[PDB]
């Protein structure tokens, strides 16, 4: 085994921080803090972060560095029976890349829309607005920026549902094209160039959040937003759904077991201290979500106090924050064009490296499993991103938000919880915390503390089971803004998630069938790792 390496420890650290620090940090965590008790919510968030989140982060990073192989081969060597975990994680990342890059396309479309002297989401007079336009959010009316997003950027109103996708928006197809060009030319030559490009796509978000914070805190009414954001209401942490929300946010915010950390740590020097790296980058993604919460809510308090808009209306998660509420706040402050440009460039750079992560997980896993691809990386990556583009043209249609919202709901989440549960079982129970502690000792020089072993062994599977149970309990059929998705759309989304999950027991059974002996010998032969 002779493989390339990062060409610098800071390239690894910035790649992992870039992948981890997603838009979920900006548009999800602050909403949860506000909704789920303010600063009190950091007690659940911090507990679930410590017992279960960082353990699985450190676990996948140590596995990836030890095995020096991608997801498919790492999982096929640690527990051959569970080689299906590698295919599951790769296929999950493959589905995630169809929808996730649309958010970056929207970010670039707003960035390119921002160059006008007056920002087009400022006003209700424009042709795409209805008589129900009002300048800012109101009950039973649409804001000017909501009108702009739904009716000019998306044109979502001209589509009658997921079945009626309508015509391609070619400005959006061109923005998704530019997204995939930046991804291609960042991932074709491999970590040699990806590790350099993340010096921008992982450091610009902090270079923006700094000034976006200085601005937001110097706006009249920012302390009111900070109060709404962090006022402690400790009764809130006595509810189980608060803890489930904290754990789901932790798990998906870090992304432990998504296959990306294997693909990256695979390129570490074998004796690199992955323990410090796991701690450093887990802290940096939690603190980045926290600081982003101030960046957001300072401006949300500015809206609630100055623009005369109710706080319950603007404080929202997901696209309707960064593409509707926050631009509607930006358009009302001096040098609005500048804040618009940097804000949407920040969103694009929060997304870009997060998509590099998934794409690099797929490319490393397949190039490690198939040498034919390893020698032809530039051509495989061109075929891959051309596939992504031609599928993503569905998202670039008028009804494309319904395709985005469906894939976003079902692609990854149910399945990735199931995969990471089986990863925690395979490592901690079948392979062993003893063997894995020996492997970590041999790499970094000291065995993992008893805290980490008890976590990996007992807490992390119960942690993922708690998440999955409270994620299935709150299941409700998919709806988006008074549009109830047809039942066949939910069936298709369950086929997506199930196709991701079925790879685990399908490959398990195929392995069990293809190995000779009686059942005890088949299990033994498929349980012994590859070096033992």
């Amino acid at each position, epitope marked *: 085994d002779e493989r390339e390496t990062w060409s610098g420890k800071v390239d690894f650290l910035l790649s992992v921080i870039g992948f981890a620090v997603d838009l979920a940090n900006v548009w999800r965590f602050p909403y949860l803090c506000y909704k789920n008790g303010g600063g009190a919510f950091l007690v659940p968030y911090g507990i679930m972060l410590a017992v279960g989140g960082i353990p699985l982060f450190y676990m996948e990073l140590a596995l990836g560095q030890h095995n020096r192989k991608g997801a498919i081969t790492c999982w096929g060597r640690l527990v051959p029976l569970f080689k299906g975990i590698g295919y599951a994680v790769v296929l999950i990342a493959f589905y995630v890349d169809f929808y996730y890059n649309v958010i970056i396309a929207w970010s670039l479309r707003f960035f390119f829309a921002s160059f006008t002297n007056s920002l087009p989401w400022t006003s209700c007079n424009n042709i795409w607005n209805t008589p129900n336009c009002r300048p800012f959010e109101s009950q039973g009316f649409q804001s000017a920026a909501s009108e702009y997003f739904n009716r000019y950027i998306l044109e979502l109103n001209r589509s009658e549902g997921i079945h009626d996708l309508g015509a391609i928006k070619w400005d959006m197809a061109l923005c998704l094209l530019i997204v995939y060009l930046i991804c291609y030319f960042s991932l074709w030559k491999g970590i040699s160039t990806s590790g350099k490009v993340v010096w921008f796509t992982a450091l610009f978000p902090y270079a923006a959040l700094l000034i976006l914070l200085i601005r937001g805190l110097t706006l009249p009414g920012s302390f009111l937003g900070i109060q709404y954001y962090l006022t402690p209401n400790f009764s809130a942490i006595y509810k189980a759904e608060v803890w489930a929300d904290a754990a789901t946010q932790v798990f998906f915010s870090l992304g432990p077991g998504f296959g990306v950390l294997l693909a990256y740590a695979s390129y570490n020097k074998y004796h690199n201290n992955v323990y410090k790296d796991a701690l450093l980058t887990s802290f940096i993604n939690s603190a980045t979500s926290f600081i982003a919460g101030f960046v957001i809510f300072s401006v949300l308090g500015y809206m609630a106090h100055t623009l005369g808009v109710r706080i319950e209306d603007v404080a929202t998660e997901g696209p309707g924050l960064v593409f509707v509420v926050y631009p509607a706040a930006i358009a009302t402050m001096p040098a609005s064009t500048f804040w618009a440009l940097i804000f949407f460039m920040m969103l694009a750079t929060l997304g870009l490296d997060s998509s590099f992560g998934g794409s690099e997980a797929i490319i490393t896993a397949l190039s490690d499993e198939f040498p034919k691809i390893k020698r032809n990386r530039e051509l495989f990556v061109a075929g891959l991103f051309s596939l992504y583009f031609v599928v993503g043209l569905a998202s670039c249609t008028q009804g494309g938000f319904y395709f985005f919202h469906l894939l976003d709901r079902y692609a990854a989440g149910y399945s990735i919880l199931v995969a990471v549960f089986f990863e925690a079982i395979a490592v901690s129970w079948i392979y062993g915390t*003893n*063997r894995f*502690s*020996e492997d970590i*000792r*041999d790499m970094i*020089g*000291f*065995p993992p503390g008893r805290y980490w072993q008890v976590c990996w062994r007992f807490v992390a599977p119960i942690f993922l089971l708690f998440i999955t149970v409270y994620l299935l309990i709150g299941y409700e059929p998919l709806t988006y803004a008074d549009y109830v998705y047809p039942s066949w759309a939910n069936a298709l989304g369950w086929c997506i998630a199930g196709s991701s999950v079925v790879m685990i027991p399908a490959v398990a059974i195929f392995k069990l069938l293809s190995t000779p002996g009686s059942l005890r010998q088949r299990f033994t032969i498929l349980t012994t790792p590859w*070096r*033992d």
Partner: antibody, heavy 119, light 109 residues
Framework: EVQLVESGGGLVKPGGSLKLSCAASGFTFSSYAMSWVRQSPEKRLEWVAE????????YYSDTVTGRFTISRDNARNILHLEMSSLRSEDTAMYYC????????????WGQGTTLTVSS | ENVLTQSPAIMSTSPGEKVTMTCRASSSVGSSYLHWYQQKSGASPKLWIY???NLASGVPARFSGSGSGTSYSLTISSVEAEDAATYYC?????????FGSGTKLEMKR
């Protein structure tokens, strides 16, 4: 307290063979990587071999590799060094040294046992 | 292998003097992988200092460690009658785990 008691070791003809054995007690032997460390009659300490906590990572020095074989008996808390094709300059006192954490060195040492290789 | 040379090979120090002995590696050791052992005449070595600065368990507080890179040092502030031993530096950072020459501390009378 942790106690390590190296045993075996005696006169051996050059070209001969021997098995040193160290009985470890008072700690969870199964957890700790153990090293064998010899010391020539000149008090030059020389590290001989290492075995990891469960015997999956065996490291030898250039002077003894291919000839010696460190092994471990986590069921009995016994550590062994087989020595084969011994030669004159292998004559030394062989300590057993516990060394799990590389960053904390060899914390506990045994008494050592002398090997005389001579005709 | 990272050969570690210790100077001086022998040193006579009357009780009370402040003495320093230097372990010089051929190759850069990590500052948390160089250790010092005290072998009393007729007994197995004890871990004396680990990670270049940390007194091990039960080490009298007069000892100290310093240095980094390829030059490390063990220093004794107020040498006493108990310091008569041979002190060996060791690097644990890369196999082979080379011990150095050892510096013998002798009392003066």
């Amino acid at each position: 307290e942790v106690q390590l008691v190296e045993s075996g070791g005696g006169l051996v003809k050059p070209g001969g063979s021997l098995k040193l054995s160290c009985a470890a007690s008072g700690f969870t032997f199964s957890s700790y990587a153990m090293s064998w460390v010899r010391q020539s009659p000149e008090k030059r300490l020389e590290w001989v071999a290492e075995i990891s906590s469960g015997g999956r990572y065996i490291y030898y020095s250039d002077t003894v590799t291919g000839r010696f074989t460190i092994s471990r008996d986590n069921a009995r808390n016994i550590l062994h060094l087989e020595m084969s094709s011994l030669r004159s300059e292998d004559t030394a006192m062989y300590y057993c040294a516990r060394g799990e954490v590389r960053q904390r060195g060899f914390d506990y040492w045994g008494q050592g046992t002398t090997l005389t290789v001579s005709s | 292998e990272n050969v570690l040379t210790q100077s001086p090979a022998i040193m006579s120090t009357s009780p009370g003097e402040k003495v320093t002995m230097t372990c010089r590696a051929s190759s850069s050791v990590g500052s948390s992988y160089l250790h010092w052992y005290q072998q009393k005449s007729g007994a197995s070595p004890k871990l004396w200092i680990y990670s270049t600065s940390n007194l091990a368990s039960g080490v009298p507080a007069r000892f100290s460690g310093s240095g980094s890179g390829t030059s490390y040092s063990l220093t004794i502030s107020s040498v006493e009658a108990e310091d008569a031993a041979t002190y060996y530096c060791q690097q644990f950072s890369g196999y082979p785990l080379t011990f150095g020459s050892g510096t013998k501390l002798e009392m003066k009378r």
